[PDB]
Amino acid sequence: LSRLDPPEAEVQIDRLITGRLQSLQTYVTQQLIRAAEIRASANLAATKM
């Protein structure tokens, strides 16, 4: 944003926003799947207790 001619900056900024979003989406999905496994483990732990 402070380095490129503004219309070129706008395009590249949007490309990076999308890239950063994809990193967040990936993280959430992976943590969401892991959370399902952790919940199952917690349920087993609760069962054993």
């Binding site: 001619d5 503004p6 219309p7 706008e10």
Partner: protein, 49 residues
């Protein structure tokens, strides 16, 4: 819903420099268009007028 029209006199190299997203001398110090535009840029040679 709305149409706006800017009617003005410029040089042929200046005609080339006026477009949405087009930066340059005329764009920043004389006649500016945005990086996001809906509309038409229309021009005619006026050597006889």
């Amino acid at each position: 819903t709305n149409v706006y029209a800017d009617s003005f006199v410029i040089r042929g190299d200046e005609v080339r420099q006026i477009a949405p997203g087009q930066t340059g001398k005329i764009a920043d110090y004389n006649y500016k268009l945005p990086d996001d535009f809906t509309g038409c840029v229309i021009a005619w040679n006026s050597n006889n007028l």
